[PDB]
Each structure stands twice: as structure tokens, then as C-alpha cells.
Amino acid sequence: NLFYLSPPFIFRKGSTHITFSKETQANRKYNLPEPLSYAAVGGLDKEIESLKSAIEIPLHQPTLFSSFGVSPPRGILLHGPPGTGKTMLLRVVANTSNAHVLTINGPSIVSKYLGETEAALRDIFNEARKYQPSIIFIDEIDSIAPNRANDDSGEVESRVVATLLTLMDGMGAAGKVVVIAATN
């Protein structure tokens, strides 16, 4: 039982009483992680519809857009009050789609000195390119791309924004990858 999220049992034929039930979830005592699906997102049906369109169009069918010689609408941005289903919408987009979910964490992607921040961004976007379709989530993109007009911005913000500008405007026209940003 220890170090196992749930203890299996080796199903064997002959005496296993397969009693079907109307419950729509696994046994509650163990509480295996419940998916955060679309039916737990109520209140934003129109907004979720718009998000769905914005994700599908660059994610699944970028090729037919790319025949026109101008890059898809890869960059989606979520903003609004800082309490209204922002990270939760990103999480549901992660769960529902079968697209490889990467993640651009704010603090943890950056180590120290040089060639580490740009290395992280290059590596993650390259992996999102190898495995397709893929979604690149940047929750609270503000914490890593401020205006550069505030005293908050230093070297690291300049690194992150330069690398993102180099990458996101470079890849395209075949990659089935979307970048979704959210901000307070």
C-alpha cells in the first residue's frame, strides 16, 4: 500500500465478482487525482468557446493557414480579474487535449549566470517541436516579461523576452504547437 497511489489486484478469471455500478468515479477513500475537465469550469461557456477556437486553429490545422505565407495566431493571452478561472482554464486545456503539455514555469526554469535561461527556453520549445501536437503554457507571463519600462526589469527579463521573441517568431508553418499565456 505504501508508496503506491492505489494498490492493484491481479484480475483473474473464475471468481472475480464483476458487479457493475452507477458510480462515475473510482473508490473515494484513496482519492485518485480527479481530472479537471470542462464540466468543472462553469460560468465561462462563451469564453471557453473562444479559447477552444483559438487553441484548435493553430494547434491542429496550422498547415492550411500557413499556405498564405503569414504565421498562424500561435500566441493566445488570457487576462482579467485575478480570481476568475485563469489557471483553472489553463489546467483544463492541459487535461482535455491529447497534445503534449509542456510548461514554462516562472522561477524554476532559470538557474544562474548565462546560457541557462535561453538554454531552458530553447530546449523546451525544441522538445515541443519534436513531440507534436504540443501546448506551451506560461502562467503569469508577467512575472517573466514585464514592460522593461519599470525598475523591476533587470538582466533576466531582457534574457527571457529576447529568447521568446527569437523562438516564437521563428518556429511555424509546420509545427503543431500553441503558446497560451495568462496574466492577472
Ligand X SMILES: Nc1ncnc2c1ncn2[C@@H]1O[C@H](COP(=O)(O)OP(=O)(O)OP(O)(O)=S)[C@@H](O)[C@H]1O
Binders in 118-157 for its own copies, by CB under 8 A: 118-119, 121-122, 126, 148, 150-155
Residue 77 or 165 having the CB closest to its own copies:
165
How is residue 43 annotated by DSSP? T
Among 56, 60, 115, 132, binds its own copies (CB under 8 A): 115
Place of cell 486545456: 93
- 96 in a known ligand binding site: no
107 binding its own copies? (CB under 8 A): yes
Nearest by Cα to 16 from 4, 24, 8: 8
What type of residue sits at position 115?
Answer: G
Considering Cα of 155, then 111, then 78, then 84, what sign does the dihedral take? negative
What type of residue sits at position 123?
Answer: D
- Backbone phi, psi, residue 84, to 5°: -115, 90
- Rounded to whole angstroms, the Cα distance separating 50 from 60 reads 16
Residue 84, binding choice from its own copies, ligand X, none, Cβ under 5 to 8 Å by partner class: ligand X
61 binding its own copies? (CB under 8 A): no
- 14 in a known ligand binding site: no
Residue 92 or 176 having the CB closest to ligand X:
92
In the complex, the residues that contact ligand X under the rule CB under 6 A are 40-44, 80, 82-88, 139-140, 182, 184
